[PDB]
Design an enzyme around this catalytic site. Structure first.
Site, PDB file in Angstrom:
ATOM      1  N   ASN A  44      83.519  80.026  36.132  1.00 16.04           N
ATOM      2  CA  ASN A  44      82.519  80.708  35.326  1.00 16.04           C
ATOM      3  C   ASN A  44      81.305  79.802  35.169  1.00 16.04           C
ATOM      4  OD1 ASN A  44      81.951  81.664  31.934  1.00 16.04           O
ATOM      5  ND2 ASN A  44      81.453  82.866  33.762  1.00 16.04           N
ATOM      6  N   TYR A  73      76.851  88.833  36.593  1.00 16.85           N
ATOM      7  CA  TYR A  73      75.800  89.479  35.818  1.00 16.85           C
ATOM      8  C   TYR A  73      74.436  88.940  36.225  1.00 16.85           C
ATOM      9  CZ  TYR A  73      79.449  90.957  32.447  1.00 16.85           C
ATOM     10  OH  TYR A  73      80.565  91.500  31.848  1.00 16.85           O
ATOM     11  N   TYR A  77      69.300  86.740  28.825  1.00 19.45           N
ATOM     12  CA  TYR A  77      70.401  86.021  28.204  1.00 19.45           C
ATOM     13  C   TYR A  77      69.849  85.009  27.213  1.00 19.45           C
ATOM     14  CZ  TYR A  77      74.346  82.750  27.820  1.00 19.45           C
ATOM     15  OH  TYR A  77      75.333  81.914  27.355  1.00 19.45           O
ATOM     16  N   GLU A  86      75.593  85.285  20.939  1.00 18.26           N
ATOM     17  CA  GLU A  86      75.279  85.208  22.362  1.00 18.26           C
ATOM     18  C   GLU A  86      75.000  86.622  22.857  1.00 18.26           C
ATOM     19  OE1 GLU A  86      78.543  84.416  24.979  1.00 18.26           O
ATOM     20  OE2 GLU A  86      77.332  83.255  26.388  1.00 18.26           O
ATOM     21  N   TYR A  88      73.205  89.640  25.593  1.00 21.24           N
ATOM     22  CA  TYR A  88      73.051  90.019  26.989  1.00 21.24           C
ATOM     23  C   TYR A  88      72.227  91.294  27.045  1.00 21.24           C
ATOM     24  CZ  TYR A  88      76.788  86.862  28.740  1.00 21.24           C
ATOM     25  OH  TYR A  88      77.548  85.771  29.092  1.00 21.24           O
ATOM     26  N   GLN A 130      79.219  88.676  20.462  1.00 21.74           N
ATOM     27  CA  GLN A 130      78.267  88.942  21.531  1.00 21.74           C
ATOM     28  C   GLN A 130      77.708  90.349  21.383  1.00 21.74           C
ATOM     29  OE1 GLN A 130      81.279  88.639  24.716  1.00 21.74           O
ATOM     30  NE2 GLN A 130      80.371  86.669  25.294  1.00 21.74           N
ATOM     31  N   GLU A 171      75.018  85.061  36.099  1.00 23.18           N
ATOM     32  CA  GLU A 171      76.344  84.609  35.709  1.00 23.18           C
ATOM     33  C   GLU A 171      77.344  84.963  36.796  1.00 23.18           C
ATOM     34  OE1 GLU A 171      77.553  85.354  31.747  1.00 23.18           O
ATOM     35  OE2 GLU A 171      79.630  84.723  32.076  1.00 23.18           O
TER      36      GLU A 171
END
Length: 184
Positions: A44, A73, A77, A86, A88, A130, A171
């Site tokens: 990741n 992704y 961000y 966090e 998106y 998130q 990502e």
């Protein structure tokens, strides 16, 4: 230039590049708001260019090439503090709780909230929420009016605190792909 994980400033832009310790990622900063990344059987990772701090009214332009093979992704961000969030704004991807929808920049988005427990964050290992805006009409170039999403999140009760950094990021998650993106 090709760099190791970390944060900093390059050619007038803030950048952040993070990965979980697996090899197989090449992140390269280019001129202006350009960045490129190749990954092959990575773990990741997150990397991109943007602004430190972000604002709740920025209109972010982006264009480039995005070719993932697996989980990935391409999104706006960033992070909030007090509360630690966090967030998106997903414009494209490879292969929870829905709270609502928002129509912005030529597509409907779906609003989601998730929770990460004991996970890496900008303050270290922590537990946080998130927020997600996920585009139905995927694309790799255009402009995102962040205010449309932030006000839509606030309507559903989703609060954002002190804006930390704000980037256009690629990502990957145990996948492969290539991408080259220009931010402005």
């Amino acid at each position: 230039q090709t760099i190791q994980p970390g944060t900093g400033y390059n050619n007038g832009y803030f950048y952040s590049y993070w990965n979980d310790g697996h090899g197989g990622v090449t992140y390269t900063n280019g001129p202006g708001g350009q960045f490129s990344v190749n990954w092959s059987n990575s773990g990741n990772f997150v990397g991109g260019k943007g602004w430190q701090p972000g604002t709740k009214n920025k209109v972010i332009n982006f264009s480039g090439s995005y070719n993932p093979n697996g989980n990935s992704y391409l999104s706006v961000y960033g992070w909030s503090r007090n509360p630690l969030i966090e967030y998106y704004i997903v414009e494209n991807f490879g292969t929870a709780t829905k709270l609502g929808e928002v129509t912005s920049d030529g597509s409907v988005y779906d609003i989601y909230r998730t929770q990460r427990v004991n996970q890496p964050s900008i303050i270290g290992t922590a537990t946080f929420y998130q927020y997600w805006s996920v585009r139905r009409n995927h694309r790799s170039s255009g402009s995102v009016n962040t205010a449309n999403h932030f006000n839509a999140w606030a309507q559903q009760g989703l609060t954002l605190g002190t804006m930390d950094y704000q980037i256009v990021a690629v990502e990957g998650y145990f996948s492969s792909g290539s991408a080259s993106i220009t931010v402005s």
